[PDB]
Amino acid sequence: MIQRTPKIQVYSRHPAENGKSNFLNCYVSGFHPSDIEVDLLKNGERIEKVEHSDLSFSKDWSFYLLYYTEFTPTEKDEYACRVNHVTLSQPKIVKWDRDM
Amino acid sequence: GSHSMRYFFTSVSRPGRGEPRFIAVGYVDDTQFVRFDSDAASQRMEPRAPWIEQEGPEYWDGETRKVKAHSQTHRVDLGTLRGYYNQSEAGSHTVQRMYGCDVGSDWRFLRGYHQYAYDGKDYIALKEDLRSWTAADMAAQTTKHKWEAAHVAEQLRAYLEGTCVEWLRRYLENGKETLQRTDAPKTHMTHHAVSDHEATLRCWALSFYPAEITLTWQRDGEDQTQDTELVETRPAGDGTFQKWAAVVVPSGQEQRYTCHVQHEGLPKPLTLRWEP
Amino acid sequence: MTSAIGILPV
């Protein structure tokens, strides 16, 4: 069967302002099969209180999911998204970039 | 103008770990309104939008009943497909099903679909005429014959041209505030150094609905689609969407370049230009 | 709403 690897984007709901209220999104799309591990990280540790959309798929039959968590960004605190899939020999970490 | 309803169903087998996972979701245009998820506590079809929560208690019972049926059907399908492809018991496998319908500005039936996949690849689907199947291979030609004998095409054509459309038109009037109004992009443009003699210009579209949008870059009013970078359109998590388009350029040339947005909500197209 | 008809096993 066809294995297709995830495309990943980490970004916030609104434009970030330090010390102001926001959501942090990790969008994993374009992948197959469906069994995927997704974790948001703060200074490299699991944020427990994370939620996710209901699994769905695209015209090409590949899966997509939004994971999100309330946060308050700041200057020094470093947010990431870690992804494991059957197509990745090791988990893939993607840092949050305010300007992407 | 046009609108649509879509239901999406996924089952995954868990070969030494019991019952198949099953998830269904339905959307009107880009707004999700319901879900069912075998592995959650309630085992009911649940509301996922405010405008659908008003619906009577017999809405949920029937939708629940029906979806557990689709489920027991996908469950049988997993066993038959393993049989047809002679795959071992050991492996995890996947069926997906998609159906629904589109309408015009006049809200009249326009087209319908019904598509089925095994292990992420076309297995059988219903053609545009609504009367015939496109079968991907020999295993699936066996299914095509079973469905030609049970008149499945006619049975789905009657759901598609009838029940699907009527109930779409319904939801539109009940969730009109959220489903008929169309948020135009808040657009903005950024600039970053990437070295001594180069610079990135990123064109941003934020906070828009529906998802259909187009971002392009021009050098002196001439398209150039290579040396660009365009991300997949992504949901903001609050109904709206986001997208950006970038292009790497020579330092000092930033006003050669222009960003062009096209969206349903904008009347003229927009043009952007690095100034700040 | 989902369909009561034409959802048959393969």
Residue numbers in the entry:
A (entry chain B): 0 to 99
B (entry chain A): 1 to 276
C (entry chain C): 1 to 10
Sentences from the paper on this structure:
This natural sequence does not have an optimal anchor residue at p2 for the HLA A2 restriction element. In summary, we used a T-cell clone derived from the TIL of a melanoma patient that persisted in patient PBMC after long-lasting tumour remission to generate a novel APL super-agonist peptide with the sequence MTSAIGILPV.
One possible explanation for why the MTSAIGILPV peptide induced more EAAGIGILTV-specific T-cells than the EAAGIGILTV peptide itself might be because it exhibits enhanced binding to the HLA A2 restriction element and would therefore be present on the cell surface at higher copy number when supplied exogenously. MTSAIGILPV exhibited substantially improved binding compared to EAAGIGILTV, binding almost as well as the ELAGIGILTV sequence. To further explore the nature of HLA A2-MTSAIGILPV interaction and peptide presentation mode, we solved the structure of the binary pHLA complex at 2.45 Å. This enhanced tethering at the N-terminal anchor position likely plays a chief role in enabling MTSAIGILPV to form a more stable interaction with HLA A2, contributing to the greater observed immunogenicity of this peptide compared to EAAGIGILTV. Despite differing in amino acid sequence at 5/10 positions, the structural analysis also demonstrated that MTSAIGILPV is a surprisingly close structural mimic of EAAGIGILTV (root mean square deviation = 0.38), sharing a virtually identical peptide backbone conformation. The peptides were also remarkably similar in terms of buried and exposed peptide side chains, with peptide residues 4, 5, and 6 forming the outward facing central bulge in the peptide, and residues 1 and 8 also pointing away from the HLA surface as additional potential TCR contact sites. Thus, the structural analysis provides a molecular basis for why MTSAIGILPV is more stably presented than EAAGIGILTV, and why T-cells primed with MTSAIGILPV can recognise the tumour associated EAAGIGILTV peptide.
